[PDB]
Amino acid sequence: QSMTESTVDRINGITPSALDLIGNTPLIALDRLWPGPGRLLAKCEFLNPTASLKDRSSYYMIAKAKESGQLKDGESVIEVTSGNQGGGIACVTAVMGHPFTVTMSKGNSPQRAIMMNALGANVILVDQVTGKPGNVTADDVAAAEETAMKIREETNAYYVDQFNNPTNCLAHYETTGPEIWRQTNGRIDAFLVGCGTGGCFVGTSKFLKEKNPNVRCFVVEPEGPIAGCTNDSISVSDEEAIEYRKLLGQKEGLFCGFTTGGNIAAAIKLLKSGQLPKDAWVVTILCDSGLKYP
Amino acid sequence: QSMTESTVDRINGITPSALDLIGNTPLIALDRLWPGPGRLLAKCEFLNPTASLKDRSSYYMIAKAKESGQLKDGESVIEVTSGNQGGGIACVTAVMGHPFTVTMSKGNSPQRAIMMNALGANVILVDQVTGKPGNVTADDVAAAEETAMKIREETNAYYVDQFNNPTNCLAHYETTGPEIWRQTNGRIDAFLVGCGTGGCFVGTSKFLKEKNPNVRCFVVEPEGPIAGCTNDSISVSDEEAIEYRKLLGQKEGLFCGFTTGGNIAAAIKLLKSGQLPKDAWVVTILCDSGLKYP
Numbered sequence: 001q002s003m004t005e006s007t008v009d010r011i012n013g014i015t016p017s018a019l020d021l022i023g024n025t026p027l028i029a030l031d032r033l034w035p036g037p038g039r040l041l042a043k044c045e046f047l048n049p050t051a052s053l054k055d056r057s058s059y060y061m062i063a064k065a066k067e068s069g070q071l072k073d074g075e076s077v078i079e080v081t082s083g084n085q086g087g088g089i090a091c092v093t094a095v096m097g098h099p100f101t102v103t104m105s106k107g108n109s110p111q112r113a114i115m116m117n118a119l120g121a122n123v124i125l126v127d128q129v130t131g132k133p134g135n136v137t138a139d140d141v142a143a144a145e146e147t148a149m150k151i152r153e154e155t156n157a158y159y160v161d162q163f164n165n166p167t168n169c170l171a172h173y174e175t176t177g178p179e180i181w182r183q184t185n186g187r188i189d190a191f192l193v194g195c196g197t198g199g200c201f202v203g204t205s206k207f208l209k210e211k212n213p214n215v216r217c218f219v220v221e222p223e224g225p226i227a228g229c230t231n232d233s234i235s236v237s238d239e240e241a242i243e244y245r246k247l248l249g250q251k252e253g254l255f256c257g258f259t260t261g262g263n264i265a266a267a268i269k270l271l272k273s274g275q276l277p278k279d280a281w282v283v284t285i286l287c288d289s290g291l292k293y294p
Numbered sequence: 295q296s297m298t299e300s301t302v303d304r305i306n307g308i309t310p311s312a313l314d315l316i317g318n319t320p321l322i323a324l325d326r327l328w329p330g331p332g333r334l335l336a337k338c339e340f341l342n343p344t345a346s347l348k349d350r351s352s353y354y355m356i357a358k359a360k361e362s363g364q365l366k367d368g369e370s371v372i373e374v375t376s377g378n379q380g381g382g383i384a385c386v387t388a389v390m391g392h393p394f395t396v397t398m399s400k401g402n403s404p405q406r407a408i409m410m411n412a413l414g415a416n417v418i419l420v421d422q423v424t425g426k427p428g429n430v431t432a433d434d435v436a437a438a439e440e441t442a443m444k445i446r447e448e449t450n451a452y453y454v455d456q457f458n459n460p461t462n463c464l465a466h467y468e469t470t471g472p473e474i475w476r477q478t479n480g481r482i483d484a485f486l487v488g489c490g491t492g493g494c495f496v497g498t499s500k501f502l503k504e505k506n507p508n509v510r511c512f513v514v515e516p517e518g519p520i521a522g523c524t525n526d527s528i529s530v531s532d533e534e535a536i537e538y539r540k541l542l543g544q545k546e547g548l549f550c551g552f553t554t555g556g557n558i559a560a561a562i563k564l565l566k567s568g569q570l571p572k573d574a575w576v577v578t579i580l581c582d583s584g585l586k587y588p
C-alpha cells in the first residue's frame with residue numbers, strides 16, 4: 001500500500017517509484033483568498049504525479065485487482081476515457097508493467113490524448129456517430145465504449161470503469177479522508193467537493209463523519225462535463241466557478257481547473273452564509289492543474 | 295526562508311501558502327528505466343507549484359530583493375519572458391502581493407501566456423520586428439525587452455532578469471544541492487543537468503563538491519531554445535532527448551519536458567560509459583511537466 005502502509009520519506013529520503021508520489025498531498029491554507037473569520041483549506045491534488053486527484057482511484061483500482069488475483073502480472077488493461085482517469089491509469093500501469101489501451105472519440109481535441117500517449121497508452125480513436133470534431137456526443141462516447149468492450153472480449157483484458165468499480169470510493173475513505181483529519185489535527189467543521197463518480201465526496205465524507213459526526217459534508221453541484229447534479233448541497237454557476245478559479249490564481253498563486261473554481265466558490269458561499277460555527281474550518285479539494293485543459 | 299528555515303510539515307500538517315510548496319521536492323529512483331548496475335535518481339521539480347524548477351529561483355530573486363529593502367511592499371515587478379520563469383515569478387508575486395507585468399512577443403503561441411495570466415500577470419504582447427506568428431526572432435525578443443525596460447523606467451518597478459541576477463544560482467546552492475545530499479544520505483557519485491541560466495548546475499554542483507569533492511558534475515549540452523552549448527560535459531541529440539522523454543513516461547509514469555529527456559539520455563550514457571565507479575549513484579533533474587508545452 002504505497003498510499004497508507006508507507007515508510008517512504010518523500011522529504012528527506014528516496015521515493016521508490018511514481019506510485020509513492022500519489023496521495024499524502026499538501027493541505028494548503030487559502031488565507032489570502034479567505035482572510036477570515038473561519039478558515040479555508042484545500043487538498044493540493046494537482047501535485048499528484050499526473051496532476052489530478054484521479055491518481056488515487058487509479059492506484060486503488062489496479063492495486064486492489066492485483067491483490068485479489070483478478071489482474072495477473074503483465075495482463076493488459078483497457079479503459080474508455082478522454083480525461084484525468086486515463087492519465088492516472090496510464091501512470092500506474094506504466095510503473096506496474098501492464099500494457100494499457102485507451103479508446104476515445106475522434107471528436108476529442110488531440111490534446112486529450114497527449115499525456116496518456118506519453119505514459120505508454122495505446123490510444124485508439126473511434127469514429128464519431130453523430131458528433132463532429134470538438135463536439136463529442138453521447139452516441140460518439142457509446143461507440144468508443146463498444147470498441148473498448150469488444151477489444152476487452154477479444155484480448156481477455158482487465159476493464160477499468162471508475163463509475164462502476166467499488167474500489168473507486170475506497171481510495172478516498174482510506175487516504176484522502178485520513179490525511180485531512182491528520183493535517184487539520186482533527187479541526188474540521190465542513191468538507192465539500194463536487195461529484196463526477198462521487199468517489200471523492202463519498203469516501204472522504206464517510207471517514208470524516210466517523211471521526212467527527214458533527215462535521216457537515218456538502219456536494220458542490222453545477223446550477224443546471226466532469227461534475228454533475230444530484231445529501232446537503234451547494235449550487236455554483238459556471239460564472240462563479242470561473243470567477244474563483246481566477247481569484248485562486250491571483251491571490252494564492254495556484255492554477256487549477258474549472259471544477260476547482262466551483263469548489264472554492266461553494267466553500268466561500270458556505271463561509272459567508274453564517275450557517276457554520278464561529279471560526280469554522282472548511283476543507284475542499286484543488287482537483288487538478290489548469291495545464292490539463294486545451 | 296520558506297525553502298530552508300522551515301518548520302512546515304507538508305505531509306502531516308498545514309502548508310501556510312504556495313511559497314511553502316516550492317522546493318523539498320521528491321528524489322525519485324528511476325529503477326525501471328535503469329535497472330543497474332549503479333542507480334539513477336532524479337529531483338521531481340515538476341512538483342513545484344507552477345510545475346517547473348523555476349519556482350526556486352523565482353522565490354529567491356523576489357525574497358532576497360525584499361530582504362535587502364530593494365523591493366518594497368506592494369511595489370510593481372516586471373519581466374520579459376514567454377517561459378517557465380514567468381510562471382514562477384507570477385506565483386510568488388501573487389502570494390506576496392506584488393503587481394506583476396510581463397512582456398513577450400506577439401509571435402508566441404497564446405498558450406505561452408495562459409498560466410502567467412491565470413496567476414495575475416498583466417501580459418503585454420509586443421509587435422514582432424522580423425518574425426511572424428510561431429517564429430519569434432532575436433529581434434522580436436529584443437523589442438519585448440525594450441518595452442519592459444521602458445515600462446520599468448516609467449513605473450520605477452523592480453526588473454527580474456534570471457540571466458543577470460546573482461541570487462539566481464544562490465537558490466540551488468541553498469536548496470537543491472542540500473536536499474539531494476540529504477535524500478541520498480550522502481551517496482552520490484555524479485550530478486548532471488543542462489544549462490539555461492546555469493543556475494541549477496552551478497549552485498547545485500558548488501554545494502555537492504563541498505560535501506564530496508570526489509563527486510563528478512557534468513553539464514548536459516545539446517549537440518549543436520531552453521538549454522545551451524558552452525566544465526565536464528555530455529552531448530545529447532534532439533533525437534536522444536525525445537527518445538528518453540518517451541522512455542521516462544513509458545517505464546516510470548512521469549510526463550516531463552524535452553530538457554528532462556536530454557538529462558535522462560545524458561545520465562544513461564554516463565552510466566553505460568564505465569567511467570564511474572562500480573555501483574555509482576547518478577542524480578539528475580526532472581525540470582518540468584510535459585503539460586507546459588503547446
Ligand SMILES: *Cc1c(COP(=O)(O)O)cnc(C)c1O
Pocket residue numbers: 052053054083084085194195196197198199200201226227257259260287288
Ligand atoms: C474526477 C474529477 C472530479 C470528480 O471526482 P470524483 O471522485 O469522480 O467525484 C472533479 N474534478 C476533476 C478535475 C476530476 O478529474
Ligand SMILES: *Cc1c(COP(=O)(O)O)cnc(C)c1O
Pocket residue numbers: 346347348377378379488489490491492493494495520521551553554581582
Ligand atoms: C530554466 C530551465 C532549465 C535550465 O535551468 P537553469 O537553472 O536556468 O540552467 C531547464 N529546463 C527547463 C524546463 C527550464 O525551465
